Design a protein around this nucleic acid. Structure first.
Lengths: 315, 122, 111, 110, 111, 111
RNA sequence: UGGCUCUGCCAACGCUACGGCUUGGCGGGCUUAGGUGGGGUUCGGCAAAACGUCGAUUACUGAAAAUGGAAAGGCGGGGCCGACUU
RNA sequence: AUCACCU
């Protein structure tokens, strides 16, 4: 919106937002030590957050890493950021990005692959899901995209507090991690759609479907996508394939042919239930081993809102 | 920022209160629809409905299980007040739906109170 | 014993209309009848939660204070007298709960 | 026993309840609290008689003496005169009858 | 007791006219000022009857709450119902019943 | 200090909340009267806390402060008008938070 | 929220310190978000505006972009006009 | 998805 955006920490801390942030942070968590300790003096704590963010005195409390959780003030500060910072980033997200965008969501992603699998009758498909998206987001070339849109010195500082501008690891477990991961992988969206003039694709954070009406082209696109996201974005590509549309696009929990869409969702349910059980088994320490495992394989099926799902059902 | 620390931070009281605030938020509108008449029972319902928060809150800022059991007794009296508001308040006070809804919310607070009573008893 | 608060709920089912009807005139007594009528469930819901015979004696007290309120609201004069019938068709109901509490007080004093 | 004081206290009540309704609206908190000490001092006897921790009997005497206060307050309340000094003496005859009973009951339980 | 109440009667006799001057506006406060003014001789009479200092300290708390009510009615109650003059004399009378209360605390707390 | 400071800071809670709690419509009567009985009547818990220097009562002062906080949450989440607007909840919560801080420091002191 | 420490009238359970008060009428005033769980994806056109992006935190204004700030233009489709269909 | 709850 007019490039710039050089005055957002004013809107992030504009109560009216720090309350939207509050109601967004508390939504679902109204049973979290964090909400309930915050809810007590909630609007005094929002006025002290309006004040700690307006004055840039805000410090993100240490991530409680079991999935790194935060505080309620922290998730509120992120909800405040990603109420002003999210809509200036999820505006530059090519429509075919489908993660952490309420409008263009999971289902619209599976619908979209199908859509532009139907139209153009794609003869071929590229899945190019990213490896450690969150654990290998440059958190540095991320902040060369969270800085070409923010341009607000103090928002940029709040972003850099809520998410340090140094490392290689967006903390999966944050709303700003969600947003910035979409933004970050939006660089590969803008190496698909902009460069690579690939008009037909879809992405949810790490999963990058790129349905293209020619095979070897989609393998080129992928190599170009991997070379980009490695050299520019330090995102190793865990799995990829250039399959004829017939193998099915294992995108976003579905297997999306032009015509049918066989929900393969099982890894998720297996993991959900596994986490589930582990917790109502007192085995929340081998769950960290399992979690680390599943955070390696089919977490590059962007099932992190599910990881936070099961960060909340169970601990 | 640091959330303004109340003392004796008790999850159960906070949760039970936050979950009981949903009971109030449901039952208070339908106490405040109880006719011009029936208003002393509504005084006492509300004093029972809105005043059960104090019971939970003092229970959380107590270590006394007496106060936890007193919070349970109040929830049971509120569970009663549902019965009364439904049946005995002769106009209506509480529709079976409203009771069916309110009893669900009070049951949620009942669960949290039970868990809270349990965790202290050990 | 939680048929008490469902036998006493028939005291309230009777005596609550015989309380909404004590006019403003006798609205300090109505408030205090309703806090002994309605608020005897509290004493039977505290009871069933501290067998501790004391609370059942304090609910006997609340039934006996309800019996006072019965006999008071009769002698409250004007078209606000709890009809002798109502004092009697409620002292029947309060005596039901008095006998269930007679048993509760028995069953808890005798272990 | 609880039934004795309570019935003799209903003479206090039956006397002081029309008087405590005739206490000016102006003196309405004192009236509502006179009545909540008139009526609802029976509750302190009944508690004292249905139970018997003698603390409950002192609370009964407290209410009787707080009732005596309400007399000696509502008489010489303020401008809207409440209880006449006569009524306070007459009431205090009956409040001293339950005074005697509850007092002798305190003494007998003690 | 007897003398504390007779000295607290003077508080009431001073403060009750002040509590009756509070407008209808702040009628809900005077309810609880008078429930603290008039209602504090329950705690001075319940402390009289019940030698336990729990109800004496409760009596002391009530006197201190009554002193708050002076502060409140003089200022916090927005049309400062009690004037600062009327606090100072009412706090003299509260201090005379606080004298006896502190000296009643004293006479109870001997060992 | 401590009790005197907490109450003077809580005066400012009441100095804000009592006007809010008196504007609450009589529709929300017992809300208004129980808000006030937890507003004004929280000084009672501060008094007892200081009068006793028993940490339980400075915790029950916190429970009154937290019930006071419920009341702002609730008088916000009251629904005929909105009784306490969220600015008045916010400013109240700020004032109660200052009382919470001094009670917290006082709790800490005794703890 | 049966109110009102609230009047005027009126009447009597009454109660009067004889004033009233009370009390009853009778008027009048005051009184979507949240919780909990676990195929429009159609076919076309314009792709002008808008929107996005790159241009650009650029030129520029101003020492300095300093939480000012474009634009032409490229790239999109997300957008649009339509039909159908929803 | 379900639950409340009014437009």
């Amino acid at each position: 919106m007019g490039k710039r955006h050089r005055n957002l920490i004013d809107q992030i801390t504009t109560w009216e937002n720090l309350l939207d942030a509050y109601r967004k942070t508390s939504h679902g968590k109204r049973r979290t030590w964090g909400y309930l300790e915050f809810k007590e003096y909630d609007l005094a704590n929002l006025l002290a957050l309006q004040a700690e963010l307006k004055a840039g005195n805000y410090e993100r409390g240490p991530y409680r890493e079991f999935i790194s959780a935060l505080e309620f003030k922290d998730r509120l500060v992120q909800h405040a950021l990603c109420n002003i910072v999210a809509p200036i980033f999820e505006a530059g997200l090519l429509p075919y990005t489908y993660a952490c965008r309420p409008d263009k969501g999971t289902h619209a992603g599976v619908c979209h692959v199908q859509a532009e699998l139907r139209r153009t009758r794609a003869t071929h498909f590229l899945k190019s899901d990213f490896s450690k998206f969150f654990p290998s987001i440059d958190r540095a070339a991320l902040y060369a995209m969270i800085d070409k849109k923010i341009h607000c010195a103090a928002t940029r500082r709040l972003l850099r507090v809520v998410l340090p501008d140094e490392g290689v690891g967006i903390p999966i477990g944050s709303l700003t991690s969600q947003l910035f991961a979409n933004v970050y992988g939006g660089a590969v969206d803008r190496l698909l759609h902009d460069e690579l003039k690939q008009r037909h694709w879809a992405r949810y954070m790490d999963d990058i479907v790129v349905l293209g009406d020619d095979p070897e082209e989609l393998r080129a696109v992928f190599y170009r996508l991997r070379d980009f996201a490695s050299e520019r974005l330090g995102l190793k590509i865990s799995h990829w394939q250039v399959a004829p549309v017939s193998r099915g696009i294992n995108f976003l929990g579905y297997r999306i042919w032009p015509t049918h869409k066989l929900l393969r969702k099982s890894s998720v349910k297996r993991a959900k239930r596994k986490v589930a059980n582990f917790i109502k088994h007192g085995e929340d320490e081998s769950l960290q081993r399992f979690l680390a495992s599943w955070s390696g394989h089919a977490q590059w099926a962007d099932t992190h809102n599910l990881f936070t799902w099961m960060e909340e059902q169970y601990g | 920022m640091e959330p303004i620390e109340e003392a004796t931070k008790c999850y159960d009281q906070m949760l039970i209160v936050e979950r009981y605030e949903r009971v109030i938020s449901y039952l208070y509108p339908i106490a405040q629809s109880i006719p011009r008449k029936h208003g002393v029972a509504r005084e006492m319902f509300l004093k029972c409905l809105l005043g059960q928060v104090e019971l939970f809150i003092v229970a959380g800022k107590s270590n006394q299980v007496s106060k936890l059991y007193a919070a349970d007794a109040g929830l049971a009296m509120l569970r009663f007040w549902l019965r009364f508001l439904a049946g005995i308040q002769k106009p209506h006070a509480m529709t079976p739906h409203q009771v069916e809804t309110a009893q669900v919310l009070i049951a949620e607070v009942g669960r949290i109170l039970g868990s809270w009573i349990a965790r202290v008893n050990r």
